[PDB]
Amino acid sequence: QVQLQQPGAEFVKPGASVRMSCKASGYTFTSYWIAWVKQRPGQGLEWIGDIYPGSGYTNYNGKFKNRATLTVDTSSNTAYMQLSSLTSEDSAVYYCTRGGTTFVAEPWLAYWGQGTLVAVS
Amino acid sequence: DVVMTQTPLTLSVTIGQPASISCKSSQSLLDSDGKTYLNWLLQRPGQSPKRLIYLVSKLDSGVPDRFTGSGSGTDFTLKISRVEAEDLGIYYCWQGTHFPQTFGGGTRLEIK
Amino acid sequence: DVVMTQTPLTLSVTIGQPASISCKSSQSLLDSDGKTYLNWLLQRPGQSPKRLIYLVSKLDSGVPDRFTGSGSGTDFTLKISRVEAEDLGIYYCWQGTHFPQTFGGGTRLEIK
Amino acid sequence: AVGIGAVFLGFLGAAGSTMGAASMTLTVQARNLLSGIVQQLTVWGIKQLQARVLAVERYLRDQQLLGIWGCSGKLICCTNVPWNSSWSNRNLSEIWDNMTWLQWDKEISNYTQIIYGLLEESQNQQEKNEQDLLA
Amino acid sequence: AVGIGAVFLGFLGAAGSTMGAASMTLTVQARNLLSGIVQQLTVWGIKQLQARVLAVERYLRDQQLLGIWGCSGKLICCTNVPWNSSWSNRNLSEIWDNMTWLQWDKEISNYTQIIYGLLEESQNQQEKNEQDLLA
Amino acid sequence: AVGIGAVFLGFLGAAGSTMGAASMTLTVQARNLLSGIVQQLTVWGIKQLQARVLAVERYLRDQQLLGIWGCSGKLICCTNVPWNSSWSNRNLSEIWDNMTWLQWDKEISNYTQIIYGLLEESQNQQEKNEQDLLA
Amino acid sequence: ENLWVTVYYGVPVWKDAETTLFCASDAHNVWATHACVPTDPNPQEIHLENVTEEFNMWKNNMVEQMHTDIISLWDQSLKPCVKLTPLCVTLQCTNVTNNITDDMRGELKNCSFNMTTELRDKKQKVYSLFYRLDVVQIEYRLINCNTSACTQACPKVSFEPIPIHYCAPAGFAILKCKDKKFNGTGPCPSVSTVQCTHGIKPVVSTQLLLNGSLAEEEVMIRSENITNNAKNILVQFNTPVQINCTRPNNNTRKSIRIGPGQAFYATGDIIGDIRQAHCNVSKATWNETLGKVVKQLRKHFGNNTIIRFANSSGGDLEVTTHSFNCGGEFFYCNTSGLFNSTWISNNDSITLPCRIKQIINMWQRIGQCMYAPPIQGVIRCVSNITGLILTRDGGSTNSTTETFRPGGGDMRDNWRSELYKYKVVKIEPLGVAPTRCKRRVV
Amino acid sequence: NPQEIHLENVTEEFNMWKNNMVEQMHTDIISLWDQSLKPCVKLTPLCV
Ligand SMILES: *[C@@H]1O[C@H](CO)[C@@H](O[C@@H]2O[C@H](CO)[C@@H](O[C@@H]3O[C@H](CO)[C@@H](O)[C@H](O[C@H]4O[C@H](CO)[C@@H](O)[C@H](O)[C@@H]4O)[C@@H]3O)[C@H](O)[C@H]2NC(C)=O)[C@H](O)[C@H]1NC(C)=O
Ligand SMILES: *[C@@H]1O[C@H](CO)[C@@H](O[C@@H]2O[C@H](CO)[C@@H](O[C@@H]3O[C@H](CO)[C@@H](O)[C@H](O)[C@@H]3O)[C@H](O)[C@H]2NC(C)=O)[C@H](O)[C@H]1NC(C)=O
Ligand SMILES: *[C@@H]1O[C@H](CO)[C@@H](O[C@@H]2O[C@H](CO)[C@@H](O[C@@H]3O[C@H](CO)[C@@H](O)[C@H](O)[C@@H]3O)[C@H](O)[C@H]2NC(C)=O)[C@H](O)[C@H]1NC(C)=O
Ligand SMILES: *[C@@H]1O[C@H](CO)[C@@H](O[C@@H]2O[C@H](CO)[C@@H](O[C@@H]3O[C@H](CO)[C@@H](O)[C@H](O)[C@@H]3O)[C@H](O)[C@H]2NC(C)=O)[C@H](O)[C@H]1NC(C)=O
Ligand SMILES: *[C@@H]1O[C@H](CO)[C@@H](O[C@@H]2O[C@H](CO)[C@@H](O[C@@H]3O[C@H](CO)[C@@H](O)[C@H](O)[C@@H]3O)[C@H](O)[C@H]2NC(C)=O)[C@H](O)[C@H]1NC(C)=O
Ligand SMILES: *[C@@H]1O[C@H](CO)[C@@H](O[C@@H]2O[C@H](CO)[C@@H](O[C@@H]3O[C@H](CO)[C@@H](O)[C@H](O)[C@@H]3O)[C@H](O)[C@H]2NC(C)=O)[C@H](O)[C@H]1NC(C)=O
Ligand SMILES: *[C@@H]1O[C@H](CO)[C@@H](O[C@@H]2O[C@H](CO)[C@@H](O)[C@H](O)[C@H]2NC(C)=O)[C@H](O)[C@H]1NC(C)=O
Ligand SMILES: *[C@@H]1O[C@H](CO)[C@@H](O[C@@H]2O[C@H](CO)[C@@H](O)[C@H](O)[C@H]2NC(C)=O)[C@H](O)[C@H]1NC(C)=O
Ligand SMILES: *[C@@H]1O[C@H](CO)[C@@H](O[C@@H]2O[C@H](CO)[C@@H](O)[C@H](O)[C@H]2NC(C)=O)[C@H](O)[C@H]1NC(C)=O
Ligand SMILES: *[C@@H]1O[C@H](CO)[C@@H](O)[C@H](O)[C@H]1NC(C)=O
Ligand SMILES: *[C@@H]1O[C@H](CO)[C@@H](O)[C@H](O)[C@H]1NC(C)=O
Ligand SMILES: *[C@@H]1O[C@H](CO)[C@@H](O)[C@H](O)[C@H]1NC(C)=O
Ligand SMILES: *[C@@H]1O[C@H](CO)[C@@H](O)[C@H](O)[C@H]1NC(C)=O
Ligand SMILES: *[C@@H]1O[C@H](CO)[C@@H](O)[C@H](O)[C@H]1NC(C)=O
Ligand SMILES: *[C@@H]1O[C@H](CO)[C@@H](O)[C@H](O)[C@H]1NC(C)=O
Ligand SMILES: *[C@@H]1O[C@H](CO)[C@@H](O)[C@H](O)[C@H]1NC(C)=O
Ligand SMILES: *[C@@H]1O[C@H](CO)[C@@H](O)[C@H](O)[C@H]1NC(C)=O
Ligand SMILES: *[C@@H]1O[C@H](CO)[C@@H](O)[C@H](O)[C@H]1NC(C)=O
Ligand SMILES: *[C@@H]1O[C@H](CO)[C@@H](O)[C@H](O)[C@H]1NC(C)=O
Ligand SMILES: *[C@@H]1O[C@H](CO)[C@@H](O)[C@H](O)[C@H]1NC(C)=O
Ligand SMILES: *[C@@H]1O[C@H](CO)[C@@H](O)[C@H](O)[C@H]1NC(C)=O
Ligand SMILES: *[C@@H]1O[C@H](CO)[C@@H](O)[C@H](O)[C@H]1NC(C)=O
Ligand SMILES: *[C@@H]1O[C@H](CO)[C@@H](O)[C@H](O)[C@H]1NC(C)=O
Ligand SMILES: *[C@@H]1O[C@H](CO)[C@@H](O)[C@H](O)[C@H]1NC(C)=O
Ligand SMILES: *[C@@H]1O[C@H](CO)[C@@H](O)[C@H](O)[C@H]1NC(C)=O
Numbered sequence A: 001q002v003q004l005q006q007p008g009a010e011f012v013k014p015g016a017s018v019r020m021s022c023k024a025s026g027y028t029f030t031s032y033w034i035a036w037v038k039q040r041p042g043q044g045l046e047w048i049g050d051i052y053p054g055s056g057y058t059n060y061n062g063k064f065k066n067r068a069t070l071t072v073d074t075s076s077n078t079a080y081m082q083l084s085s086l087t088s089e090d091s092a093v094y095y096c097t098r099g100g101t102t103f104v105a106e107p108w109l110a111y112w113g114q115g116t117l118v119a120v121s
Numbered sequence B, C: 001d002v003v004m005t006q007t008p009l010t011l012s013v014t015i016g017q018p019a020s021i022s023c024k025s026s027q028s029l030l031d032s033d034g035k036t037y038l039n040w041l042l043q044r045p046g047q048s049p050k051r052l053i054y055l056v057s058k059l060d061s062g063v064p065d066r067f068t069g070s071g072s073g074t075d076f077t078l079k080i081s082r083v084e085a086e087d088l089g090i091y092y093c094w095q096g097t098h099f100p101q102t103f104g105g106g107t108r109l110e111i112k
Numbered sequence D, E, F: 001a002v003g004i005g006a007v008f009l010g011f012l013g014a015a016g017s018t019m020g021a022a023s024m025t026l027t028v029q030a031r032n033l034l035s036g037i038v039q040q041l042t043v044w045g046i047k048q049l050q051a052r053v054l055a056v057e058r059y060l061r062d063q064q065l066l067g068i069w070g071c072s073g074k075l076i077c078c079t080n081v082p083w084n085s086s087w088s089n090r091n092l093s094e095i096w097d098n099m100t101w102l103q104w105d106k107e108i109s110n111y112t113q114i115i116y117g118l119l120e121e122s123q124n125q126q127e128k129n130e131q132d133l134l135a
Numbered sequence G: 001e002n003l004w005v006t007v008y009y010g011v012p013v014w015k016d017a018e019t020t021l022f023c024a025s026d027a028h029n030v031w032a033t034h035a036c037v038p039t040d041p042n043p044q045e046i047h048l049e050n051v052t053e054e055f056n057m058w059k060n061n062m063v064e065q066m067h068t069d070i071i072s073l074w075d076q077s078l079k080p081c082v083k084l085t086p087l088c089v090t091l092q093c094t095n096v097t098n099n100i101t102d103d104m105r106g107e108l109k110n111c112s113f114n115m116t117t118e119l120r121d122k123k124q125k126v127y128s129l130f131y132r133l134d135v136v137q138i139e140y141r142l143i144n145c146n147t148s149a150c151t152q153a154c155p156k157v158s159f160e161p162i163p164i165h166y167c168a169p170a171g172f173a174i175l176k177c178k179d180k181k182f183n184g185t186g187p188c189p190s191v192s193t194v195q196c197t198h199g200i201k202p203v204v205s206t207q208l209l210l211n212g213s214l215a216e217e218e219v220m221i222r223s224e225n226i227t228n229n230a231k232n233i234l235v236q237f238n239t240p241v242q243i244n245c246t247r248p249n250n251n252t253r254k255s256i257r258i259g260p261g262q263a264f265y266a267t268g269d270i271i272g273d274i275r276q277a278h279c280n281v282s283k284a285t286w287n288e289t290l291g292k293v294v295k296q297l298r299k300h301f302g303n304n305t306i307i308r309f310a311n312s313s314g315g316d317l318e319v320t321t322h323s324f325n326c327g328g329e330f331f332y333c334n335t336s337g338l339f340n341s342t343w344i345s346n347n348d349s350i351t352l353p354c355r356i357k358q359i360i361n362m363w364q365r366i367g368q369c370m371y372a373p374p375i376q377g378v379i380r381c382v383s384n385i386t387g388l389i390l391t392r393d394g395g396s397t398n399s400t401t402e403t404f405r406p407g408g409g410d411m412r413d414n415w416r417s418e419l420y421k422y423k424v425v426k427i428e429p430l431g432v433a434p435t436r437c438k439r440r441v442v
Numbered sequence H: 001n002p003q004e005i006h007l008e009n010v011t012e013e014f015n016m017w018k019n020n021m022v023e024q025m026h027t028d029i030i031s032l033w034d035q036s037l038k039p040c041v042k043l044t045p046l047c048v
Helices: D019-025 D025-031 D046-071 D092-096 D103-134 E019-025 E027-033 E046-069 E101-134 F019-025 F027-033 F046-069 F102-134 G061-078 G283-297 G413-420 H020-037
Strands: A003-005 A022-024 A035-040 A046-051 A058-060 A071-075 A078-081 A093-098 A115-119 B010-012 B020-026 B040-042 B051-054 B067-072 B075-080 B090-094 B107-110 C021-023 C039-043 C051-054 C067-072 C077-082 C090-094 C106-108 D076-082 G004-008 G023-024 G094-096 G108-113 G128-131 G135-136 G140-142 G165-167 G172-175 G208-210 G220-222 G233-247 G252-261 G263-268 G278-281 G322-324 G331-333 G352-353 G379-392 G404-405 G422-427 G431-435
Touching: A003 A093, A022 A093, A022 G172, A046 A071, A046 A078, A078 A093, A078 B020, B010 B020, B051 B067, B090 G023, C021 C106, C039 G404, C039 G431, C051 C067, D019 D092, D019 D103, D019 E101, D025 D046, D025 E046, D046 D076, D046 E046, D046 F027, D046 F046, D046 G023, D076 D103, D076 E101, D092 G233, D092 G431, D103 G004, D103 G431, E019 E101, E019 F102, E019 G220, E027 E046, E027 E101, E027 F046, E027 F102, E046 E101, F019 F027, F027 F046, G061 G413, G061 G422, G108 G208, G108 G352, G128 G263, G208 G233, G220 G283, G252 H020, G278 G283, G331 G379, G379 G413
Parallel strands: B010 B107
Antiparallel strands: A003 A022, A022 A078, A035 A046, A035 A093, A046 A058, A071 A078, B020 B075, B040 B051, B040 B090, B067 B075, B090 B107, C021 C077, C039 C051, C039 C090, C067 C077, C090 C106, D076 G004, G004 G431, G023 G165, G094 G108, G108 G128, G135 G140, G172 G422, G208 G379, G220 G233, G233 G278, G233 G379, G252 G263, G278 G352, G322 G331, G331 G352, G379 G404
16 A cells, blocks of 8 residues: 555754654655645645655745755655744644656645644744 | 635535535646646545545546536536535645646535 | 679670670669769680770770770670680679679670 | 656656657756866876866767767757668657667667768768858 | 947956947957967976866856757857746846946846756757657 | 778878868868877876877867857858958969968968958857847 | 658766776865865765666776775875884893783783984983784894885874765766665666765775675675685675774873984883783674574575584784774784584674784785884774675585685775675767658758 | 956955965965975984
């Protein structure tokens, strides 16, 4: 089964950093795109970013002015994300969703995980 | 960019009635290849997001008979014949042709 | 490549008769400069090869009156009015415009 | 639809894709032939000079070579030269969209000098006709 | 009338003139990128090699860069790519004949990679269209 | 007829033939400016680097020089610039098919910079006219 | 209709070519010397799918390139400090008997000599303590005296290993396999390319690899022709085995001036007890590690064969014993205790009596040498055992009850365990493709 | 012929005490000093 394991919840402090992991299992990690999604309970879904688990090419949303650094590991089949140093109002849950292939790209948002609760306090 | 707005902010429905929800795109989403990759996903209240329609003409696995996706170009719609507890939720229309891959504004289905 | 074939494999002639020999080219040999560099050489039986006609319209030194080279394009011919001991031999038509500079197939003149 | 067969497949990334899909990735390949050593004793002093000169010289040989063929300044350029069909009796669909480029070059590596032996002759000819038309 | 805004204003001489008047002085600038060390132990031996290689490498990077864009071989060349008007909401007369070039590059230096990020895509796209017409 | 005045006359082989017959031998000349040292301590270490860099630098100077003139990418190219007839009052037949090229360059070596002093001006002027038509 | 040719530039093509690489170090020393260009901390590795590539271990020029490269660094770092020409004077030596353990009786030799002082017209009497493996009876002279005299390790320029990154020049690429079952040579269906290799520690050893890069999943036996006993067998573990090494002596350093602005550092007077240097490795971990090695090794040989282990086959001290350079002081150690076992089908440490030789002969180039000054106080070591370099014994009859012994010792094999994945390839951008093309004639 | 050319309608910034030319010359001449001292007699035996 295609599953994207995520940590349960992380409690961080202002001025600190986080290591937002996203495990890949039950498929080939070197082809499918990986993207992150925000699910603020009081707001609609927002596009955070996208990391290509192959060439390492990174793309970032316009509103973010490259505030995050995205890293992946092809050996352990994992993906990582930096914030970097977010603040209080950005305390919500992020979902690491699997995209499609760089050729077809139609199956985007095929599978999701459970997310992780980021509550900086 | 191309915004995704949906007319129904609140949709009051009783069990056993047909529900209507629609979405709009500022610019036509017809891709050069000749397909519309729009996705209609019903985000459950607290559970992981789940897609319901992809390639709006086509439908996803575990087909529910009530859901019938339709629409092209600027107008997108999804008709449900009967309402169930699962139907009660938030629907998002997601474009899949332009950058960024913006989601829908969100239409809420609640009983009042 | 352009092959050089000759109809007469064996040519029986007695002393004092007119001999006829011809050659063919698969493709026309007319060079851009406006000349045909075909050579008609009569290889003696055991001696060094000797040319008889070059630039078939033109003739070589030590002109023999009997030999009269003629022909252009695809057809090449050499008419001999009288037969002498020197005439008995093998003639080769050598193309001189394309690569390789192929020789003729060889026509044998013998008395039977 | 952000995922299109394009540059972000990575440097040398198209080497695993079909020949047809690799055409759009030819720009990410020319960029990584000079840079990489921009930022800077015998050991590592002469070596840096030897490596830099070799990289510069290698790129020049191709730029010169494209110059003689008349294709310089066009990443994808072609001439009016026909080729001996005996080299590869295959259809366009049978070459571009069904096999990778890596094994392709191996088969026709024998005639690399021969096929090069026709490009420059025609380019010089093409100049000669232009001279005739010019005059 | 021997005094015309031209080459004899000097190498880098147009840097004080308006952008429009500096266009005719673009030939005196490309000539002074290679020469100057034509005429000719560790000190000054490796230094000469390091300086010469760097000068050759620097010029080549631009020649290669113009090669990918398809503008190589033309000192003043332009493609069909449009640009986001938000970068500079100014008129032609408000850019060329009323301000120097030196401070112009400072304002637009932010989008140098972005504007470059559109040139090569169009050039490859142009080649693909030529390939379609070619076929 | 395999013997045609062509490349197989040898590198520098056209130096003994007339100028007209030497035009077809201009491709064997550009090939022998870079190669020859492809295959490979102070003595012969620095010398190899000095020789390689000089060969690369010399070739680039001509490539850049042709680039400014706008003839780059074409082995035989000519602009629209006229020339002062006083330099050589000779006919075309009196130049190409009756005299060798070696002694030719000696006579007109005096005006090499002057004749170069007109090529780049026209090329930039050509670009400016294209800019006017462009706009 | 008849197809024509088209010129393609930059299309991905690989040709097997090898050239000179470049060094890069992370943010004085002997390896980096703050000379190699720093490497940015974004090693962009890219996975190439739908591709296979061939790797030729033991033929890679990277191994040869690194072997010659570091030797040049060794010679470069030794030039700028004092030579030890005037230390070959006659040594009137004596035994050490002040609080000496029976195991090291007669190892250290208290010595006195008339070595010169800074002034050219004056002499001085200086006494120093030398190990038995640094002097030879004629009463005594240094071991290296009849051979070329060597310099003294510049005291400040430590030889502590530092990871070094190798990057190829522009126009070349480095490919690394990723399959966890990779043998010494063969296709890998997980080919990837990276401009710079990961950190490679040039740390030295002869028998047990120290601070190496462990395998991915299982113990790997990477070897070329295996039926041939003449070539070494390289083994890489999967879980590190901790190794402890320490020098118990509380040594002190004495500085003696030899000439104008040239000083030599001697040993002694020692303080405290006299105890032999020893290393420690857990018994339970080693037995498990060896058991795993034989399990994988048994897949390449008979299952019923009785695998045995034994110490080296003797020879010169350089190759017969384990060597390392912990703390700047060299140790030659006898590892007979790590191979005394037999395996049939179906307490917390080991005491390894080590040895110290102060005069060092480096790579078997015999014309060179160096001196390592002593270091005050005790020295402690903590390293990881990552593999072994075994050798196959000959004379086996019917290939039954086969045994291996540690050996080899060539420095090339140590790096081969780190450079087996990486190979250098060349880019051939030019190419020709056939299609229906008509050039626009002017 | 040190052709000096005057650029008008321009201003430029100069950072004295940060110029690398000062550093370049300081290290350059020291290399010349060491280079010139190598090829002649050492004075080792004068410390008597
Ligand atoms: C395998 O890797 C491990 C991991 O690092 C490595 O252990 C390291 O050993 C060195 C050497 O002892 C340690 O650094 C030393 O620490 C002591 C005690 O603090 C210091 O006194 C030492 O200083 C001396 O050396 C300096 C130069 O390095 C001199 O400048 C100084 O004046 C002293 O003479 C030295 O800093 C290091 O802490 C450990 N690392 C860890 C993580 O424990 C081991 O040595 C490696 N194996 C081999 C065979 O090298
Ligand atoms: C590596 O090889 C595999 C072989 O299976 C490739 O899988 C195929 O990939 C294509 C596109 O990446 C998939 O989509 C196909 O696209 C073509 C052209 O648009 C279309 O005509 C087909 O109908 C199909 O949609 C295809 O489904 C997939 N599976 C196959 C071919 O069986 C993979 O793409 C290759 N990857 C690389 C990087 O080369
Ligand atoms: C430096 O800046 C001064 C600013 O005053 C410039 O002075 C102006 O220079 C121009 C030409 O050099 C003078 O002539 C003008 O030319 C334009 C275009 O041909 C024409 O339309 C005008 O009617 C005028 O004739 C001008 O009188 C003069 N004074 C001004 C502008 O007040 C000077 O040219 C600049 N020099 C350089 C090298 O940039
Ligand atoms: C070296 O100089 C001699 C000078 O005699 C040259 O001899 C001449 O060479 C030409 C061709 O090589 C011979 O053929 C002539 O060709 C022209 C042009 O096609 C044609 O119009 C003439 O009718 C003639 O056929 C020519 O007979 C010969 N003799 C002369 C000119 O007196 C020789 O060619 C030169 N070689 C080189 C390599 O420069
Ligand atoms: C020798 O082998 C031992 C294992 O027996 C190695 O210990 C391991 O060291 C790594 C770091 O080099 C540890 O990973 C680190 O974990 C921390 C969190 O504790 C994290 O912040 C770091 O980013 C890194 O991931 C690893 O946990 C540790 N394992 C154990 C069991 O201790 C040791 O590093 C090896 N030493 C050498 C020189 O090879
Ligand atoms: C490396 O160390 C090992 C032991 O750690 C050394 O082997 C030891 O050699 C001595 C000398 O022969 C053995 O002592 C004698 O053994 C004989 C055997 O019959 C006995 O009859 C004598 O009474 C005496 O005890 C000692 O047993 C042996 N150690 C073991 C465990 O067997 C080896 O010599 C060392 N090699 C080097 C090069 O340092
Ligand atoms: C290495 O292991 C040996 C063996 O256990 C240790 O030797 C012990 O030394 C202490 C003194 O420090 C004695 O009291 C013990 O009796 C010794 N053990 C045995 C079995 O005799 C040695 O200390 C260890 N060294 C290190 C650095 O770990
Ligand atoms: C090796 O030496 C170390 C230090 O002298 C011993 O102590 C261990 O030290 C590490 C830290 O490097 C700790 O994580 C361990 O918990 C320590 N172990 C104990 C028992 O205290 C270590 O025991 C020695 N191991 C061997 C096999 O000799
Ligand atoms: C390897 O171990 C063997 C143990 O059997 C050693 O053999 C002994 O070696 C000593 C001297 O080294 C001799 O005095 C004994 O007579 C030997 N006994 C036997 C039974 O062989 C051998 O020396 C060791 N060799 C090395 C290189 O460690
Ligand atoms: C066929 O091959 C020959 C050489 O074997 C070559 O001369 C000829 O030009 C080729 N045909 C074409 C059309 O190129
Ligand atoms: C190419 O050449 C090699 C050796 O030169 C030969 O083995 C192979 O058969 C040739 N292939 C073709 C298609 O001519
Ligand atoms: C406007 O800017 C965006 C990025 O901010 C870019 O994607 C777009 O191409 C620009 N518009 C034009 C016409 O280039
Ligand atoms: C350009 O970038 C700099 C710093 O990156 C910033 O201070 C400046 O405001 C930017 N200018 C524009 C026009 O975006
Ligand atoms: C004639 O020579 C003069 C210089 O002596 C030059 O200025 C002029 O341009 C030349 N004529 C032509 C037509 O080039
Ligand atoms: C060319 O210049 C030289 C010296 O500069 C002179 O002797 C010769 O007469 C000049 N020739 C012409 C044709 O001007
Ligand atoms: C010194 O030690 C050696 C070691 O074997 C011994 O032979 C010698 O007799 C000893 N001499 C003295 C004076 O203790
Ligand atoms: C050192 O000099 C003293 C004084 O003459 C002498 O007694 C002694 O034997 C000398 N030692 C050596 C090793 O030459
Ligand atoms: C130096 O002396 C040692 C002492 O035995 C000997 O082994 C070695 O061969 C000698 N070397 C030379 C070069 O004489
Ligand atoms: C690796 O190479 C060896 C030696 O040629 C061979 O026996 C083996 O089958 C290859 N593959 C593996 C997985 O070991
Ligand atoms: C070595 O390899 C050859 C072939 O590569 C093989 O025939 C032989 O059995 C192997 N072993 C020995 C000892 O030669
Ligand atoms: C070595 O011998 C000298 C001379 O007797 C003495 O002063 C010194 O203390 C001795 N050193 C040791 C470690 O015994
Ligand atoms: C090591 O393993 C072997 C395998 O059976 C066993 O015989 C031996 O007793 C073990 N030794 C220790 C110390 O555990
Ligand atoms: C040894 O046993 C294993 C299973 O335990 C088996 O896979 C292997 O083939 C056996 N070895 C031989 C040589 O048959
Ligand atoms: C191996 O260890 C046993 C344990 O007592 C010992 O009897 C035997 O002598 C040892 N053999 C070797 C070669 O070390
Ligand atoms: C060695 O002995 C000296 C004597 O005072 C002492 O100061 C020093 O701490 C000792 N070193 C160690 C490592 O115990």
